[PDB]
Swiss-Prot record:
Compartmental location: Nucleus, Nucleolus
Protein name per its UniProtKB record: Nucleolar transcription factor 1
DNA-binding region: 18-82
General function of this protein: Recognizes the ribosomal RNA gene promoter and activates transcription mediated by RNA polymerase I through cooperative interactions with the transcription factor SL1/TIF-IB complex. It binds specifically to the upstream control element.
Residue window of the full protein shown: 288 to 382 of 765
PTM notes: Phosphorylated and activated by PIK3CA.
Domain of life: Eukaryota
Organism: Mus musculus (Mouse)
Oligomer status and interactors: Homodimer. Part of Pol I pre-initiation complex (PIC), in which Pol I core assembles with RRN3 and promoter-bound UTBF and SL1/TIF-IB complex. Interacts with TOP2A in the context of Pol I complex. Interacts with TBP. Interacts with TAF1A. Interacts with RASL11A. Binds to IRS1 and PIK3CA. Interacts with DHX33. Interacts with PHF6. Interacts with CEBPA (isoform 1 and isoform 4). Interacts with DDX11. Interacts with NOP53. Interacts with ALKBH2.
Length: 108
């Protein structure tokens, strides 16, 4: 059936699950650009800023669910995958992803 006709040069959908966006803002950016087929990446990126500024709270909240939702799946897809790999493997993945739980120098 599908023996991999073509490949990629990122290698993101193999080592780790679907990486969820940072927040609704960045998420909407990809959503708008995907719809803005008749708009250059330069206009799209700029549009996402305006379209996001005009969007109401109820509208922005909708995108928030998608972002958070992606995190839920990312955790599961990452968990089922991690456990699937040995300690050594889980260590590398855990020492790169688990270490970065969305934080900086300190909570402040």
């Amino acid at each position: 059936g599908s023996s991999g006709s073509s490949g990629q040069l990122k290698d993101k959908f193999d080592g780790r699950p679907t990486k969820p966006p940072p927040n609704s803002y960045s998420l909407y950016c990809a959503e708008l650009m995907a719809n803005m087929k008749d708009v250059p990446s330069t206009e799209r990126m700029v549009l996402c800023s305006q379209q996001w500024k005009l969007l109401s709270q109820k509208e922005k909240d909708a995108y928030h669910k998608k972002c958070d939702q992606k995190k839920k799946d990312y955790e599961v897809e990452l968990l089922r995958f991690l456990e699937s790999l040995p300690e050594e493997e889980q260590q590398r993945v855990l020492g790169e992803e688990k270490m970065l739980n969305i934080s900086g120098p300190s909570s402040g």
